[PDB]
From a paper:
Here, we present the cryoEM structure of the KATP channel harboring the neonatal diabetes Q52R mutation (hereinafter referred to as the SUR1/Kir6.2Q52R channel) in an open conformation bound to amphipathic molecules consistent with natural C18:0/C20:4 long-chain PI(4,5)P2. At each Kir6.2-SUR1 interface, one PIP2 molecule is bound within the site that is conserved among Kir channels (referred to as the canonical site), and a second PIP2 molecule is at an adjacent site, stacked within the regulatory interface between Kir6.2 and SUR1-TMD0 (referred to as the non-canonical site). The phosphate groups are coordinated directly by Kir6.2 residues R176 and K67 while Kir6.2-W68 forms close interaction with the inositol ring, although K170, which is about 4.5 Å away and H175, which is about 5.5 Å away, are also in close proximity. Here, the PIP2 head group interacts with surrounding residues including K39 and Q57 of Kir6.2, and N131, F132, P133, and K134 of SUR1. The structure of the PIP2-bound SUR1/Kir6.2Q52R channel has an open Kir6.2 inner helix gate. Clear cryoEM density shows rotation of the Kir6.2-F168 side chains away from the pore’s center, thus causing a dilated pore size. Specifically, the sidechains of Kir6.2-K39 and R50 flip away from ATP-interacting positions, with the K39 sidechain now coordinating PIP2 at the non-canonical site; moreover, the sidechain of Kir6.2-E51 forms a salt bridge with R54 to partially occlude the ATP binding pocket. In particular, the sidechain of Kir6.2 residue 52 (Q in WT, R in the mutant) now faces SUR1-TMD0 and interacts with SUR1-W51, tethering the Kir6.2-CTD to SUR1-TMD0 in a rotated open position. The cation-π interaction observed between Kir6.2-Q52R and SUR1-W51 in the open conformation led us to hypothesize that this interaction may contribute to the gain-of-function gating effect of the Kir6.2-Q52R mutation, by stabilizing the Kir6.2-CTD in a rotated open conformation.
Numbering used by the authors:
A (entry chain E): 1 to 272, 281 to 615
B (entry chain A), D (entry chain B): 32 to 352
C (entry chain E): 997 to 1043, 1060 to 1316
Write the structure that this text describes.
């Protein structure tokens, strides 16, 4: 039984092409390899000739590039395409293992589609960087061929009464959609960036920025993948080890977010009084269309967070069940089809799906962080411009004193606008916490029932405790600062003058009350320290209590069946990914009230 | 420091920030021949191997579509005889394209599409055969490797000849064959600032060599002394022996271009003499003798120099006496 | 860096420092056993201390109490070493030569006496405690995977090597970015300090356009330092997450293979996978504290 | 207006009313190689395909005349074995001419005419194989495509150098390989009327460039500035800055000719600077720098110019002061 594309069953009767070639399942699958080998045989000669040929003495670096229309959509579709093909390869392998012979047509065409899909992304990116809109025809031909050959396979399933119950029917259907949409994207760039059919090759309109302006922060210009992996910074850090950085290598800020363009929109939104309520409306209008983007990534990252425990729950149940019996129980044209329920039954499938689920989740939460921070510092620059504008011109007839208060203004831009900035750093965090919490407890209730409710309730009740000790900790430092300032003031009376204070030999008695001035502050340090230690075992040791109140409660008050490893670890995993997003909840609440004071302070000091 | 041209003729210049990749893509053949040998072998191998695979799938596919892969009974004439698996199709593709043609796997007259592919493969096979075989011979028969047997002196010499200072060097040819239409070009490479303030980092000033009928023409069969007379209009007219130290920013480039007699392709041999590689109080030693009825050139003493009494003044001061 | 950190144990003495090491190491070991017994109990649940498994709960009850005392054991000792550092600096300050004081700027001493000691008091013991638990949990997380499958550790070591290189290139770049962010912070607020005084000397005399635009030079220099620092952190986390996510796949695939290769395992496999998911999360935390400890490492340099 | 030479080197001249078509017919090979690639592929394809068809009919015909096409009984040795229809004859022609030779269809020793055709087809097959394969390699290895990597400046400059106005431009080579025996020719193209009344619509006046040993010879490994000194006998001796507008009828052509080192075939790169493409008060910015031990050329700043103080008077007025 050697390797066979169509499998060696009967007398290799699966190779017969009577009653039409397109009615032979293997031939249609073989026909689907045609687009993929076409893409490899076209792009590889082109990629090698223009990109991989000259090196080590000929540098063709492009420090300027314009994305083709639909760049973001194309990368999104390919990532979906790459994910679906992985499912199709995994689906094929499960069906293939049942038969005595290996049917290569089940996964090899999908496996070779995976290489072509990656190559298309690589081919497109190199073309897109160096314009070459004419070379997009190769992708245009590839998508058309792939769409045609996947439509044929999908139609033949419909003829052979292959419903949505068979997974391979669904995966083929999605590929028709994904190839169809990618075909439209290629048509879209022809319309927007006419380069072949029309006789007017519309001007590329090079970006206003990204010229030789010294811009080194390439985050808003790199491709979508590099935005999610920060690959552009990798080269910058690769040389930062060799040479210390400076304000010159760090370059200039991109035009869209230097300082003024942030403030320019800020004052534009102000057109609508200038009270606290009016301030929030402008900030929401100016920095809301970008803030929701960070929250949306955070929400999706939170949703995929549960994909950890769910895969943990799925893998253990189908692993501890033993049996090891695998049968698709669905054979069409002599080919086994695995149902959707059976597909999510194999441990290997769950492990691979979990691995892909994590990568999308980890990237999304990182993407949520940067967008919030980038928007946060964008507001910080705009706010500082507004504050400076308030102090400067357009502030005629100053009220009295030394401009209200010299000290107040100094800390207003020092430790008050930062609180507003840090509010936007954690603004999605507060919004996304309830969504993760409510789904987390619900999933716990569907795993351990009553016992999970008690374990989740105490963790929820810990949030007021964490805020309660936060106020005590904050007050302790406030009392400490009153004594520390006296200790600092007493010490900083001849400390700077110790060059001449020691000459008079009067420091022998001066450095005798230092302990007294420090003990009055150390006793406040003890109050601050005990509150910190209180928060430690109220945070580090609380997961242990949560596990016990859920575990031993299965018989103390629940009286149910013996817990399985799957339900225990799934709740343990859910608890682990739930306790950690609680410390931020206490912190964001403390930051929320702190920022609310700061914005009120800015609003009242605005006029 | 850095050398504009290495002692072996390699040019130490790196081209950076080129934003015209379209030009390289439009010039494919020059790129193909300019590749290093390990890449040339890979491209040569992958050009034929991928061609065989591409048509192997086509031969395998049409045999599938015709039902030839199915062993069910007989009484059917296949498109190509004795094709069973992809390996048979791949072997058949090699036989057709390399024109081996064993005949166990033979095209039959039942499938006009198969005859169509046979026409296409042969036409495509010939074009790949023509370009790749010709490309690898051009890669082999490049004339730059002939420049490895053209040797220059390791040191240049400035000395008095016929009452005037002359920048002299020796160039020889190791091979028995000739360099047809050999020409010598000598240039001075240094940073020169014009009075208007313009600065040229590598201003190449072309200096003449004394030939008697002009210049840029030699008959290189025995090692010649190529020398440039330093006079009022020479760039070295203000060169002093104190300037001949390592950090001077003064480089002399010698270029020898001619048609290789054996091959017929023009070549080019380059060398460079920095400031510290030029010797002031020296003179080349004769290396040409007469043994029996045939002149013998002793290449062991090729670069040897012997000190001679030479004034330590510049060529400008020599005219002023 | 950290080479001079071999000192500073004198403030912690020997009995106090060893107690923290014994206590901190104990807590992680017990938690490893607590999860291990949970896996064995659940494995034994589906079928001999099988009766109601309160012994494991009793072992879990002492851990939190042992964790409770560890929380204050490392905190109380941190206060005393601050007192000893305060006492040691005071004696040196009194005995500091006047001629040396005159030669020196005498301002760094005041900053080191006040600013550095304040960081040592309220921050360093907390950061060191957080670093210790993070750098120990990952090692414990790197042993539960070994216990569930001794085959995973074959490729675990090369991944940790790649993690070392990534961390080594981040701390160098991040610290320099921290310096520039600190460098650009001073002119921004000082300009505002110069803005509140002499503003009438600026409004009347000058058009004020230069001074306002001069601030934009300060803010832009400040903003770029902030986002470059942010981007370096985001760069660090992503490559750390991908290493962690890759670890999960290797651990899961190896663990599944053993069960299907007649190597039993059963519910014991599920225990390791939960730790494997935490490996990525704790990997970021350990690197975060290591950079913070560098400030502590430099803090003793001003005192040494 | 119209350009005599495009910026890319294309010559915008159309030849009209040629009544000597016999000259083109008498020169066939140059026509064959000068065809565009789609025509070259068609001719290459149709040369072999028609050759196979022509002999396929001959093989089919003599098999007909010998009775081989008739399946009546056996005991008769055919001219060529296993030939039944024209498709069999066509397949046999491909096997013989491309020298595949499967052997299912084989020449036998019964028909001397068949042996005669086998001799004729092989001789004709070799000549077509020799000419066409060699022709398509010459088409591929043309040296004009190498000129696509010889960039010129997009603007010329007329500044002051050494006290005299100089028409300057920059020429560079993107490839690592060299241009052997590179020569630069500069010409002025405009309509000049002699005093006798003769008018030359495109009188090409050849202007020299300063080289120091004559001219028409450069060593192009780094981007050189090629400049012509405007003196009494120069054609630009009466050129004023007011004349550098679009509608002036004044064009400068730069020609770079040399042997391609990689290939061995002489190439030619051309460019033209109209009146409005010449900048008066400008000067090229240096781009050659030294990094470590290797000079680095920054091609991003290739054509950039910086304004410099230059008199607004013609070179004639400069001598008159
Ligand atoms: C019981 C079993 C017994 C076994 C016994 C073993 C038996 C082993 C069997 C047979 C092989 C031994 C064969 C002996 C052959 C000599 C070939 C003669 C042609 C020839 O010239 O090739 C030679 C030798 O290399 C090869 O052999 C390269 C030959 C081409 C390789 C093609 C292989 C195809 C790969 C396909 C495989 C994959 C196919 C996949 C199949 C599946 C598909 C479905 C190439 O060597 P070279 O000298 O020309 O190259 C050097 C070198 O590359 C330097 O880098 C280069 O420096 P630069 O150019 O300056 O940068 C030198 O230049 P210089 O002249 O200035 O110094 C060159 O001189
Ligand atoms: C179940 C079935 C499955 C089917 C799957 C499909 C399977 C499809 C199967 C097989 C084919 C795909 C083959 C893949 C081949 C690559 C060939 C490699 C050789 C090769 O180089 O050919 C390439 C590709 O074109 C062809 O392919 C042309 C190849 C020659 C075509 C000969 C065909 C013979 C026709 C006979 C038919 C009629 C026969 C009648 C029979 C009956 C007789 C009785 C030629 O392309 P090129 O790049 O050299 O040409 C361009 C282009 O022409 C531009 O116009 C030209 O501009 P200019 O020269 O400046 O005017 C460009 O010049 P630049 O360099 O300056 O940019 C050239 O670069
Ligand atoms: C059944 C499955 C069938 C699978 C096989 C398919 C068989 C079917 C076969 C052939 C057809 C599929 C053909 C792909 C289709 C359409 C491509 C059209 C785009 C195109 O025109 O190609 C060229 C690139 O030249 C090459 O590299 C072209 C290089 C050759 C391209 C084909 C490679 C041939 C080898 C492939 C075979 C390999 C076989 C083994 C290797 C044989 C080696 C002899 C365009 O690219 P470009 O860079 O020249 O154009 C740029 C660009 O357009 C700019 O916007 C434009 O303005 P500026 O840059 O500002 O001046 C400039 O335009 P110009 O080109 O006019 O200067 C250029 O700068
Ligand atoms: C299961 C998992 C399911 C989901 C997996 C998704 C993975 C998706 C990976 C896709 C990567 C493609 C990203 C684009 C690559 C690309 O464009 O490379 C191009 C790079 C060069 O860089 P540049 O920015 O052009 O450089 C500028 C320079 N001045 C220049 O112009 O030049 O230089 C190159 O040309 C580099 C080519 C490298 C090609 C690598 C492709 C991927 C290899 C396999 C990894 C993924 C598969 C893993 C399976 C497990
Ligand atoms: C390995 C996994 C790869 C995952 C890639 C994630 C990429 C992170 C997203 C990210 O950083 O987006 C950020 C970008 C940047 O916005 P901007 O500054 O406004 O720029 C656009 C322009 N100024 C405009 O808005 O006009 O924002 C945008 O411009 C829009 C971003 C939309 C992102 C949508 C993400 C959905 C991904 C779905 C993938 C599912 C399948 C994944 C399977 C494979 C997993 C390995
Ligand atoms: C593979 C590396 C190829 C590469 O280095 O690709 C280079 C580009 C950089 O992004 P860019 O072209 O937009 O930068 C503009 C340059 N002119 O793509 C990427 O890095 C995308 C991220 C690669 C994905 C890596 C994820 C796993 C590690
Ligand atoms: C062929 O195999 C199929 C199994 O799908 C079954 O009908 C039987 O075993 C064989 N039938 C014939 C007619 O050979
Ligand atoms: K044969
Ligand atoms: K042959
Ligand atoms: K043969
Ligand atoms: K035979």
């Amino acid at each position: 039984m050697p390797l066979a594309f169509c499998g060696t069953e009967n007398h290799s009767a699966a190779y017969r092409v009577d009653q039409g070639v397109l009615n032979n399942g293997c031939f249609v699958d073989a026909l689907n390899v045609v687009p993929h080998v076409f893409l490899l045989f076209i792009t590889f000669p082109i990629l090698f000739i223009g990109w991989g040929s000259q090196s080590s003495k000929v540098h063709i670096h492009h420090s300027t590039w314009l994305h083709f229309p639909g760049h973001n959509l194309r990368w999104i579709l390919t990532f979906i395409l790459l994910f679906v093909l992985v499912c199709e390869i995994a689906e094929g392998i499960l069906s293939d293992g049942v038969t005595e012979s290996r049917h290569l047509h089940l996964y090899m065409p999908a496996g070779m589609a995976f290489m072509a899909a990656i190559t298309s992304v690589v081919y497109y990116h190199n073309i897109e960087t160096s314009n070459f809109p004419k070379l997009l025809i190769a992708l245009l031909i590839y998508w058309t061929l792939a769409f045609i050959t996947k439509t044929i396979k999908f139609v033949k399933f419909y003829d052979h009464a292959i419903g949505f119950s068979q997974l391979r029917f669904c995966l083929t259907g999605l590929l028709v959609i994904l190839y169809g949409m990618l075909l439209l994207v290629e048509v879209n760039v022809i319309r927007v960036r006419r380069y072949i059919f029309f006789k007017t090759p519309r001007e590329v309109k090079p970006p206003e920025d990204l010229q030789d302006l010294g811009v080194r922060f390439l985050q808003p210009f790199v491709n979508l993948l590099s935005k999610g992996t920060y690959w552009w910074m990798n080269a910058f850090i690769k040389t930062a080890h060799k040479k210390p950085i400076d304000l010159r290598a760090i370059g200039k800020l991109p035009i869209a977010m230097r300082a003024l363009t942030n403030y320019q929109r800020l004052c534009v939104a102000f057109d609508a009084p200038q009270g606290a309520r009016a301030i929030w409306r402008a900030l929401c209008h100016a920095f809301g269309r970008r803030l929701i983007l960070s929250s949306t990534f955070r929400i999706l990252a939170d949703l995929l967070g549960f994909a950890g425990p769910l895969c943990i729950f799925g893998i253990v149940d189908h692993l501890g069940k033993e049996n090891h019996v695998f049968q698709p129980k669905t054979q069409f044209l002599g080919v086994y089809f695995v149902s959707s329920q059976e597909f999510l039954g194999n441990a290997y499938v769950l492990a691979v799906l979990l691995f892909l689920a994590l990568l999308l989740q980890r990237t999304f939460l990182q993407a949520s962080y940067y967008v919030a921070i980038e928007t946060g510092i964008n507001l910080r620059g705009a706010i500082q411009t507004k504050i400076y504008n308030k102090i400067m011109h357009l502030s005629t007839s100053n009220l009295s004193m030394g401009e209200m208060t010299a000290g107040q203004i100094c800390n207003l831009v020092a430790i008050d606008t930062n609180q507003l900035m840090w509010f936007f750093f954690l603004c999605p965090n507060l919004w996304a916490m309830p969504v993760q919490i409510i789904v987390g407890v619900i999933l716990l209730y569907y795993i351990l029932g009553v016992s999970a409710l008690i374990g989740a309730a105490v963790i929820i009740l810990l949030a007021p405790v964490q805020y309660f000790v936060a106020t005590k900790l904050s007050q302790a430092q406030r009392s400490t600062l009153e004594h520390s300032n006296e200790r600092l003031k007493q010490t900083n009376e001849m400390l700077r003058g110790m060059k001449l204070l020691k000459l008079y030999a009067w420091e022998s008695i001066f450095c005798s009350r230092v302990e007294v001035t420090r003990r009055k502050e150390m006793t406040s340090l003890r109050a601050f320290a005990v509150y910190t230690s209180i928060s430690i075992f109220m945070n580090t040791a609380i997961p242990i209590a949560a596990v016990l109140i859920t575990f031993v409660g299965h018989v103390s008050f629940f009286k149910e069946s013996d817990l399985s490893p799957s339900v225990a670890f799934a709740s343990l995993s859910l608890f682990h990914i739930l306790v950690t997003p609680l410390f931020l909840l206490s912190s964001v609440v403390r930051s929320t009230v702190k920022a609310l004071v700061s914005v009120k302070k800015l609003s009242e000091f605005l006029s | 420091r850095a050398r504009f041209v290495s002692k072996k003729g390699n040019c130490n210049v790196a081209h950076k920030n080129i934003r015209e990749r379209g030009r390289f893509l439009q010039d494919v053949f020059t790129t193909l021949v300019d590749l290093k040998w390990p890449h040339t072998l890979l491209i040569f191998t992958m050009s034929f191997l991928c061609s065989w695979l591409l048509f192997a799938m086509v031969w395998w596919l049409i045999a599938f579509a015709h039902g030839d892969l199915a062993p069910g009974e007989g009484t059917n004439v296949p498109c190509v005889t004795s094709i069973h698996s992809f390996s048979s199709a791949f072997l058949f593709s090699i036989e057709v394209q390399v024109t081996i043609g064993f005949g166990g796997r033979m095209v039959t007259e039942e499938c006009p599409l198969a005859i169509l592919i046979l026409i296409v493969q042969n036409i495509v096979g010939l074009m790949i055969n023509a370009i790749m075989l010709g490309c690898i011979f051009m890669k082999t028969a490049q004339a730059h490797r002939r420049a490895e047997t053209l040797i220059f002196s390791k040191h240049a010499v400035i000395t008095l000849r016929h009452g005037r200072l002359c920048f002299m060097l020796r160039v020889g040819d190791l091979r028995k064959s000739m360099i047809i239409s050999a020409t010598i070009h000598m240039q001075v490479v240094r940073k020169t600032t014009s009075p208007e303030g313009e600065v040229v980092p590598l201003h190449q000033v072309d200096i003449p060599m004394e030939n008697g009928v002009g210049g840029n023409s030699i008959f290189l069969v025995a090692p010649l002394i190529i020398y440039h007379v330093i006079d009022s209009n020479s760039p070295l007219y203000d060169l002093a022996p104190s300037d001949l130290h390592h950090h001077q920013d003064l480089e002399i480039i010698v270029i020898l271009e001619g048609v290789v007699e054996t091959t017929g392709i023009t070549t080019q041999a380059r060398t460079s003499y920095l400031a510290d590689e030029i010797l002031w109080g020296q003179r080349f030693v004769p290396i040409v003798a007469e043994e029996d009825g045939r002149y013998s050139v002793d290449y062991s003493k090729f670069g040897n120099t012997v000190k001679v009494p030479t004034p330590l003044c510049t060529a400008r001061q020599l005219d002023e006496d | 860096p950290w080479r001079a950190c071999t000192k500073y144990l004198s403030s912690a003495g020997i009995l106090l420092l060893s107690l923290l090491v014994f206590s901190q190491l104990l807590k992680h070991m017990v938690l490893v056993a607590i999860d291990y017994w949970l896996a064995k109990w659940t494995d034994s649940a589906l079928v001999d201390q099988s009766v109601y498994a309160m012994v494991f709960t009793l072992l879990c009850s002492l851990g939190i109490v042992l964790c409770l005392v560890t929380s204050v054991t490392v905190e109380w000792t941190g206060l005393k070493v601050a007192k000893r550092l305060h006492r040691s600096l005071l004696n040196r300050i009194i005995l500091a030569p006047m001629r040396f004081f005159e030669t020196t700027p005498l301002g760094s001493i005041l900053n080191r006496f006040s600013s550095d000691c304040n960081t040592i008091d309220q921050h360093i013991p907390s950061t060191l405690e957080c670093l210790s638990r993070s750098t120990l949990l990952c090692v414990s997380a790197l042993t539960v995977i070994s216990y569930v499958t001794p085959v995973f550790l074959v490729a675990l070591l090369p991944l940790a090597v790649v993690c070392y290189f990534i961390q080594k290139y981040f701390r160098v770049a991040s610290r320099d970015l921290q310096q520039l962010d600190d460098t650009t912070q001073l002119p921004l607020l000082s300009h505002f300090a110069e803005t509140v005084e002499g503003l009438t000397t600026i409004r009347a005399f000058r058009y004020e356009a230069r001074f306002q635009q001069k601030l934009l030079e300060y803010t832009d220099s400040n903003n770029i330092a902030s986002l470059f620092l942010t981007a370096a952190n985001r760069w660090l986390e992503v490559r750390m997450e991908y290493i962690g996510a890759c670890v999960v796949l290797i651990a899961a695939a190896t663990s599944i293979s053993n069960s299907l290769h007649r190597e039993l395992s059963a519910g014991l496999v599920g225990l390791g996978l939960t730790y494997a998911l935490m490996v990525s999360n704790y990997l970021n935390w350990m690197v975060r504290n290591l950079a913070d400890m560098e400030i502590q490492l430099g803090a003793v340099k001003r005192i040494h």
